[PDB]
Design a protein around this ligand. Structure first.
Ligand code: CDL
Ligand code: CDL
Ligand code: CDL
Ligand code: PC1
Ligand code: 3PE
Ligand code: 3PE
Ligand code: 3PE
Ligand code: 3PE
Ligand code: 3PE
Lengths: 64, 345, 63, 98, 120, 459, 52, 54, 140
């Protein structure tokens, strides 16, 4: 019971914001988001430029 | 009080707002406000305690200052136009004098600092008749001059009224003060919809009155002035918990309760007149109002606070206190949303 | 019953809803125009009553 | 008449400023209230006499009667304050904040 | 907003012109709901006065239902008159001001060029 | 739709007039008949939508949700009948009344043809969930869970109300079919972006999106079993139905305004699956699994492919059934042991072999075992997301791997292993709870057998 | 007024001295009687907006 | 991400904001002298706002 | 002063940067004077000296908020060469929030002020660009 309480209902009572966990929470909550945003944005703009320029070929792609 | 002075004081309390609404002369509306204030003062002072003395004194000085500002504006309009009505070309300064004085009379922020002050210290029937009956006459005066007033000052007063009402009702515990800040927020909604559609102002006033009256009556059932005092209601009268929950949710504006209808139709008309920003801000402050209502619901109904040993005596005794008028108003203030086209005009 | 009943019921529903939408838009336009320049039944703000003016000859002839 | 009415309005404004700006005496606050009452009487009477409005001549008597009943009720409340707390200092009436 | 219309006789619940309107059919969902609210009011009153909820005060419950149906019927008649006169004033103003409400020559889906936004 | 709404309405006087020794039997039987009556909406022999009246309408998307709600209510009553046995008759009838009110309002919400009525029933079904969770929850933070749930939902829903009233003022009727036919493009302005965000955020809170999902795990942990079932099986899908309805009038700026929510959904399903791995609570594990699956539904709805919509709808139905089944099994163990700790009861395969079979079947449905509708929807969401961007397969693969890990970890640590021999209070099985798992699992197999019923609007 | 009880009952409790060109004691006209009369017969019947 | 930073960011921060602001707005001393000085300030501000709006 | 407030918008963003900073500092100073008057009215100090001290402190804090708001918004718009975009106003509002947090001596207030004031400034810029009405005259 003490282990479950410490793991669940005590973390926010015993949390105090420091510079270290502020930086850690910022990077862990945003860096993956920014990274995957850039990956998907560059891929989708590449696909969009290819498909309006006409070089990308969808030979049998009708189940999009 | 003997029945002679009871009848005379109650008749003058009734007569004030009736004179104010019936009269076409600004002077006779002013004397109707005078009857209302003078007649209701002895009923506040009736219990004869220092808190009643403080409440009566603060209420008197506030209404005295507001009535003199009303009289100043009436006299200035009579000097400018030669008539006794703000017709079409009365001065905007005069109209703003009327608006500030009537906002002082109503008790909305930033003129709201006396309404919890007065509502605390007086008995619950006094808070009921104040917060319900004493606002019809100033709202009647404001409705009569609706196309001339200044929407900027009205919207600013309404915004700050609901903001401080929500924050106060968030803060304290005392039930009368809770009702006072609820009144301040609802009057903010009323005043905001006033310059565009006074019919919705009257609809909000009627919904607010039929929601505010029965829960005062439920407070008068056991004279519960405290969150804890209404929290041990389940041992005293458990048949009231469901209606208390429904009335508090309707005051919060949760659908499908009919108390959602005034806020909804007010937002509809306000967006018809394109004040999106005000509509959204007012809606968030109404959410805070719903927060302290929901906290009250948690205290009284959804949990079960510990009780005393003498509640056994209170359950042994019988009571015939709740009249037939409670249930009618509670049902008409809880289950009336599908009649919304009939309620609106 | 069949597909024609649902088809024509949907047509009736669509006609009713479209007429209601047009009526609401026209109501907003009428209310806007009437409040802007009140000349119809609505937004007729009050005026001092004509019937309470003395027309009898008075003490001063310069009236 | 314009200068007279302007200084009457300024007298009302000064009495209103005094009424809003409390000192220690609720009695002085009430006296400022009747300063406003008197300014209203004078303005209404001067306006009626200037416009020759004998139909509106009842209005000063009306405001005198109603504001005098107001003053009587306020005096009764001040009497209750003084009887409750010995003195009539307005700072004693602050136990309803909580 | 409609209080200043011509022919407005003051404080009239139901003017004679309203008698040209169809009355409610007396078994319609609004009045049925009003009767249901009256019955629920009587039941809740029985609970609050700590009586049997359905087995006590049958005359009281009948009085609640009857009064609710009566008031609902007459208020519904007034509201129907109000909506009817609102629509009549609206159509009259539209007819009287035809330059402000022009019929738009609404054109088919053969000359208008809706932009195409692919989803890919 | 009236022939389903009206007898569900008449269930409440049946509840309050039935004998205290017959009320559970009567309400359960008549609610099963309600579900059987609600099965008539699948008579869809033509492409035209079933518009029953000017107020209620049926749809290939609305129909599975209505049938799921009408089927779920008797199972809610079955699940709730045990923990209310030491309660007063008026309290039991009040609980049944709340469940029936939930059922009625959810049918009316899914069958609403008009979004203002949809919002009215949205808050209407918000209310008795609050009442159920806060009154019949067990421990002391049920009030906190109710506050978080209600205010997340209401702060989401208020700008939805403002956006709906603006849409009505701009167009004229806000009827769904009128909007779908005479929709117009949006000029990609900042006001239109704010309008889009306002009418999207309510459902995004409800589903929930990652980062605003915090109300869901506490609500499911502190809720009663019927509350957990109704939340995880209907209300998230109610949000999902919300976006599918509202998204048709938001072309074309959803193409670029869809970007942050897809990313939040993918990284959130990975994060919540990781939390399911390192979670110490079984109800919290099921709740975070629900968050991950609803994140998949979010990503599909935002990428707006027809295969995404079809996979989303099938995942809605599949996840509702399997999450309700998982909550039912967890609640059976909870009434056995009076604890929600994941590791306290370990060797339950020994003493509950049939319930271990139900556990295995539920987790196999959870980790998307083919040919079930779970993997059917998940695979079509994968196809549509890969068509949207080929790099989504990395996040999908991580999510599927962690999904298999947390499902098999739950089975291994709850059923497999040595029996905790100190748990002497392990009653063998209730026919009620075994029937509850069977009524959860059989419609999953039937929908696996015929997946055309839940393919949604597009196909 | 907000309530038209005076107009419904046909009585005139306070409507007969609203303005300067109303009834006066012993037929003594107030100042600007002609001007205010012409303003009122101008403004009558057209409403406040058209009157302004 | 759950038990520290999202909970610190959205819900507890809104609750702390509203608790601080309700303490600030309900720090009232119950003195009608201060209340009427506040009312005088309101009158001055509304007069100024009318003067600058016209 | 209404002419001052409408002379804020006579020139686009990124031009007359000193003038924009001065106007926004004046607006913040007026708001600070109003708030300080309310504070010393509702919550009187123990003596006039620290009453005037808190008036000056509140006025300087709000004036610093306005000054950093105007300077940051103008600098961002000028160096990014796009005036009619709400991101510049969001960075300016965040700078005002960090100014509030630096005066309050708390990074929590700094972050809350950043988010809230940036959002408020962004919607203010959006409303100014796209004709939102804060105080609409009754039309219907
Ligand atoms: C220019 C001249 C001054 C230069 C200067 O001082 O630079 C250092 C200064 C930071 O001060 P410091 O050296 O960390 O102070 C440490 C204390 O002295 C010693 O620490 P302490 O324990 O005494 O202080 C207690 C605690 C005080 O308590 C707090 O700080 C409470 C937490 C505040 C917010 C933390 C955000 C980061 C965490 C996010 C987690 C994930 C969210 C979900 C995803 O302090 C901290 O936690 C230290 C870090 C403070 C960061 C403040 C950031 C303010 C701006 C935020 C902008 C918006 C961010 C995104 C918001 C998104 C919302 C949806 O600024 C910078 O480093 C520049 C960047 C600032 C952020 C942008
Ligand atoms: C057993 C109980 C019923 C006994 C009935 C005895 C009398 C009888 O035979 O009546 C036949 C009478 C014959 O009517 P009809 O002229 O043939 O056409 C009726 C059709 O339904 C055609 O009527 P309609 O479809 O045109 O409906 C009229 C309209 C206007 O009618 C109404 O507004 C009445 C609504 C009643 C409900 O209804 C609505 O607009 C419905 C709005 C629904 C959403 C409103 C949002 C609020 C929450 C949900 C409703 C309220 C429930 C309680 C509040 C708490 C919710 C948690 O039918 C009804 O009275 C229908 C309603 C019956 C059930 C009433 C409620 C229980
Ligand atoms: C049926 C449903 C509606 C019933 C309304 C009345 C409720 C009532 O009085 O219940 C008592 C009574 C049962 O009481 P009992 O147990 O026998 O004895 C009383 C106890 O001894 C008393 O024991 P106690 O007082 O010592 O302790 C009890 C106390 C202990 O306190 C507590 O337990 C505290 C509870 C706290 C949590 C609950 C907070 C409140 C929640 C309200 C609902 C919220 C969610 C719904 C959404 C918003 C709705 C506004 O209170 C309660 O347990 C709660 C009492 C009320 C329970 C019933 C609530 C019904 C309303 C909600 C469901 C229906 C509407 C929503 C759904 C609509 C469709 C979508 O109920 C009935 O008899 C129901 C009526 C059945 C017969 C219907 C006949 C219909 C005839 C139609 C034809 C004739 C009329 C024709 C009219 C038209 C002519 C043209
Ligand atoms: C759960 C999330 C809650 C917060 C996010 C909600 C959505 C955010 C984006 C939308 C803006 C805010 C809601 C506006 C609702 C109406 C939208 C609309 O109609 O837009 C078009 C309208 C514009 O109307 P328009 O489109 O007619 O514009 C005029 C266009 N011409 C001139 C061409 C005709 O947008 C607005 O008016 C938006 C003004 C909003 C001002 C107030 C915002 C206050 C803060 C809101 C959130 C508060 C709760 C959260 C607090 C923090 C909690 C952690
Ligand atoms: C959007 C919000 C952004 C918030 C950014 C907060 C930056 C905080 C910078 C900082 O001070 O980092 C300190 C951290 C570890 O340093 P310290 O606090 O001493 O750790 C104690 C135990 N190692 O230092 C590091 O972790 C090293 C960082 C290197 C880059
Ligand atoms: C019991 C009540 C019985 C009422 C009987 C009729 C009383 C009456 O005179 O009603 C008319 C009254 C005013 O109608 P009208 O002249 O249009 O005035 C506009 C003011 N809103 O009409 C109204 O006040 C309409 C609203 C009545 C609401 C009644 C229910 C609350
Ligand atoms: C990634 C997406 C990002 C974008 C979306 C972000 C928004 C997500 C949705 C919003 C979530 C809000 C959550 C609100 C509930 C959590 C707060 C709470 O529960 O506070 C509890 C606390 C009172 O607790 P108490 O009962 O006193 O003690 C605990 C036990 N005894 O309460 C208090 O102390 C005060 C609580 C006040 C009421 C809180 C709920 C209403 C908030 C209204 C906000 C209005 C915003 C606009 C305001 C004007 C402009 C600034
Ligand atoms: C860029 C981000 C600026 C953030 C400014 C801020 O809010 O700082 C808060 C901080 C509180 O001060 P404190 O915690 O006492 O530490 C003093 C050591 N500098 O305040 C300070 O440290 C003030 C430092 C001077 C102003 C810096 C800007
Ligand atoms: C027109 C303009 C209107 C602007 C309205 C807002 C004005 C700025 C904010 C004022 C905050 C006043 C109260 C306060 O200081 O709250 C900060 C709160 C508590 O900070 P603490 O370190 O406890 O300091 C003691 C109390 N001052 O600190 C915290 O709770 C720390 C929160 C850290 C993370 C915040 C992230 C953003 C939260 C909102 C996200 C919205 C999306």
């Amino acid at each position: 019971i003490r282990w479950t309480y410490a793991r669940s209902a005590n973390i926010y009572p015993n949390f105090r914001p420091t510079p270290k966990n502020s930086l850690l929470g910022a990077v862990a909550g945003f860096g993956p988001l920014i990274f995957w945003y850039y990956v998907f944005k560059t891929d989708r703009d590449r696909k969009e430029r290819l498909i309006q320029e006409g070089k990308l070929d969808r030979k049998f792609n009708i189940s999009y | 009080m003997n029945p002679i002075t009871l009848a005379i004081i109650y008749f003058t309390i009734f007569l004030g707002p009736v004179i104010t609404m019936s009269s076409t002369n600004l002077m006779l509306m002013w004397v109707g406000l005078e009857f209302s204030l003078l007649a209701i003062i002895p009923m506040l002072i009736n219990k004869k305690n220092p808190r009643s003395t403080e409440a009566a004194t603060k209420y008197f000085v506030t209404q005295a200052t507001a009535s003199m500002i009303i009289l100043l504006a009436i006299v200035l309009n009579y000097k400018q136009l030669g008539t006794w009505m703000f017709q079409q070309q009365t001065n905007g300064l005069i109209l703003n004098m009327t608006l500030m004085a009537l906002s002082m009379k109503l008790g909305l922020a930033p003129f709201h600092f006396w309404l919890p002050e007065v509502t605390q210290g007086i008995p619950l029937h006094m808070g009921l008749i104040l917060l319900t009956w004493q606002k019809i006459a100033p709202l009647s005066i404001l409705i009569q001059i609706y196309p001339l007033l200044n929407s900027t000052i009205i919207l600013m007063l309404a915004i700050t009224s609901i903001f401080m009402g929500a924050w106060g009702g968030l803060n304290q515990t005392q039930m009368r003060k809770i009702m006072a800040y609820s009144s301040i927020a609802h009057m903010g909604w009323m005043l905001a919809i006033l310059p565009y559609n006074p019919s919705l102002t009257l609809l909000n006033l009627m919904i607010y009155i039929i929601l505010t009256a029965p829960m005062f009556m439920a407070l008068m059932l056991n004279n519960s002035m405290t969150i804890n005092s209404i929290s041990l209601l389940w041992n005293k009268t458990p048949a009231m918990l469901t209606m208390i929950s429904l009335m508090l949710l309707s005051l919060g504006g949760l659908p499908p309760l009919t108390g959602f209808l005034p806020k909804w139709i007010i937002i509809t008309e306000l967006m018809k007149n394109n004040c999106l920003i005000m509509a959204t801000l007012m809606a968030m402050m109404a959410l805070l109002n719903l927060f302290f209502y929901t906290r009250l619901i948690y205290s009284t109904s959804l949990t079960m606070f510990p009780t005393n040993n003498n509640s056994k005596m209170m359950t042994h005794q019988t009571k015939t206190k709740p009249n037939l008028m409670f249930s009618t108003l509670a049902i008409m203030s809880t289950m009336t949303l599908p009649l919304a086209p009939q309620l609106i005009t | 019953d069949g597909p024609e009943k649902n088809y024509e019921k949907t047509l009736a529903i669509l006609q009713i809803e479209s007429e209601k939408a047009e009526l609401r838009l026209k109501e907003q336009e009428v209310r806007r125009l009437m409040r802007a320049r009140g000349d119809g039944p609505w937004y007729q703000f009050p005026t001092p009553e004509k019937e309470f003016i003395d027309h009898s000859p008075k003490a001063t002839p310069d009236n | 008449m314009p200068s007279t009415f302007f200084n009457l309005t300024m007298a009302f404004s000064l009495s209103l400023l005094g009424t809003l700006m409390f000192r220690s005496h609720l009695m002085s606050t009430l006296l400022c209230l009747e300063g406003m009452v008197l300014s209203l009487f004078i303005m209404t009477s001067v306006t009626s006499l200037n416009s020759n409005s004998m139909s509106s001549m009842p209005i000063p008597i009306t405001i005198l009667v109603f504001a005098a009943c107001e003053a009587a009720v306020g005096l009764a409340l001040l009497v209750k304050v003084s009887n409750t707390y010995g003195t009539d200092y307005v700072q004693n009436l602050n136990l309803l904040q909580c | 907003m409609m209080n200043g219309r011509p022919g407005h006789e003051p404080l009239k619940f139901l003017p004679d012109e309203a008698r040209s309107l169809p009355p409610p059919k007396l078994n319609d969902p609004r009045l049925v709901y009003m009767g249901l609210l009256g019955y629920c009011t009587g039941l809740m009153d029985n609970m609050l006065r700590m009586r049997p909820v359905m087995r006590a005060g049958l005359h009281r419950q009948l009085l609640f239902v009857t009064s609710f149906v009566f008031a609902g019927y007459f208020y519904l008649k007034r509201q129907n008159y109000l909506y009817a006169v609102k629509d009549h004033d609206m159509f009259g103003y539209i007819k009287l001001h035809p330059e402000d409400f022009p019929e738009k020559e609404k054109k088919t889906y053969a000359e208008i060029l809706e932009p195409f936004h692919p989803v890919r | 739709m009236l022939k389903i709404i009206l007898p569900s309405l008449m269930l409440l006087p049946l509840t309050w007039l039935s004998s205290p020794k017959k009320t559970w039997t009567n309400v359960t039987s008549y609610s099963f008949l309600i579900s059987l009556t609600s099965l008539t909406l699948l008579w869809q022999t033509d492409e035209n939508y079933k518009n029953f009246s000017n107020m209620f309408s049926s749809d290939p998307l609305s129909t599975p949700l209505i049938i799921l709600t009408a089927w779920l209510l008797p199972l809610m009553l079955m699940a709730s009948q045990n923990h209310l046995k030491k309660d007063n008759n008026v309290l039991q009838k009040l609980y049944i009344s709340m469940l029936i009110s939930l059922q009625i309002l959810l049918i009316m919400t899914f069958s609403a043809t008009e979004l203002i009525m949809f919002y009215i029933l949205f808050e209407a079904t918000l209310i008795p969930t609050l009442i159920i969770i806060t009154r019949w929850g067990n421990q002391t933070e049920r009030l906190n869970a109710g506050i978080y749930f209600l205010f997340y939902t209401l702060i989401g829903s208020i700008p939805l109300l403002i956006a709906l009233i603006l849409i009505q003022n701009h167009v004229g009727t806000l009827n769904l079919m009128i909007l779908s036919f005479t929709t117009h493009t949006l000029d990609a302005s900042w006001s239109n972006n704010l309008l889009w965000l306002a009418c999207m955020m309510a459902f995004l809170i409800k589903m929930p999106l990652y980062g605003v999902h915090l109300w869901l795990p506490k609500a499911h942990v502190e809720a009663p079993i019927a509350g957990s079932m109704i939340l995880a099986a209907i209300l998230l899908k109610l949000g999902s139905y919300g976006m599918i309805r509202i998204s048709i009038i938001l072309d074309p700026l959803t193409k670029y305004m869809a970007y942050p929510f897809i990313l939040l959904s993918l990284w959130g399903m990975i994060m919540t699956s990781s939390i399911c791995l390192r979670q110490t609570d079984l109800k919290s594990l099921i709740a975070y699994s629900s968050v991950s699956h609803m994140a998949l539904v979010i990503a599909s709805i935002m990428i707006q492919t027809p295969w995404s919509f079809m996979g989303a709808t099938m995942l809605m139905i599949a996840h509702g059934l399997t999450s309700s089944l998982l909550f039912c099994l967890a609640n059976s163990n909870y009434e056995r042991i009076h604890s929600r700790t994941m590791i306290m009861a370990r060797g339950l395969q020994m003493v509950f072999p049939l319930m271990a079979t139900w556990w295995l079947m539920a987790s196999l449905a959870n980790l998307a075992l083919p040919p079930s509708i779970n993997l059917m929807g998940e695979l079509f969401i994968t196809m549509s997301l890969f068509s949207w961007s080929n790099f989504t397969i990395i996040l999908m693969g991580i999510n599927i791997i962690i999904t298999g890990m947390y499902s098999m970890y739950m089975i291994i640590t709850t059923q497999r292993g040595k029996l905790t021999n100190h748990m002497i209070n392990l009653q063998p099985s209730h026919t009620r709870e075994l029937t509850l798992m069977a009524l959860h699992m059989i419609p999953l197999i039937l929908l696996t057998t015929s997946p055309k019923l839940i393919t949604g609007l597009t196909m | 007024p907000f309530l038209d009880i005076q107009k419904k009952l046909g009585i005139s409790l306070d409507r007969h001295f609203m303005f300067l060109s109303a009834e006066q004691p012993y037929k003594n006209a107030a100042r600007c009687h002609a001007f205010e009369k012409e303003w009122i017969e101008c403004a009558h019947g057209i409403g406040g907006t058209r009157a302004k | 991400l759950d038990l520290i930073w999202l909970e610190k960011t959205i819900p507890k921060s809104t609750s702390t904001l509203h608790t601080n602001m309700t303490t600030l707005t309900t720090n009232q001393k119950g003195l009608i002298k201060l209340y009427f000085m506040s009312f005088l300030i309101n009158i001055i501000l509304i007069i100024i706002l009318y003067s600058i709006n016209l | 002063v209404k002419r001052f407030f409408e002379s804020y918008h006579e020139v686009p963003d990124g031009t007359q940067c000193h003038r924009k900073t001065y106007i926004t500092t004046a607006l913040g100073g007026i708001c600070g004077i109003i708030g300080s008057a309310y504070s010393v009215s509702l919550n009187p100090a123990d003596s006039t000296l620290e009453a005037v001290a808190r008036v000056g402190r509140y006025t300087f804090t709000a004036a610093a908020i306005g000054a950093m708001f105007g300077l940051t918004t103008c600098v961002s718009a000028q160096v990014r060469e796009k005036p009619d975009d709400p991101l510049n106003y969001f960075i300016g509002g965040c700078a005002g929030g960090l100014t509030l947090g630096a005066r309050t001596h708390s990074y929590g207030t700094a972050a809350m002020g950043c988010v809230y004031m940036g959002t408020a400034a962004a919607l203010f810029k959006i409303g100014k660009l796209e004709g939102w009405e804060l105080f609409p005259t009754p039309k219907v």
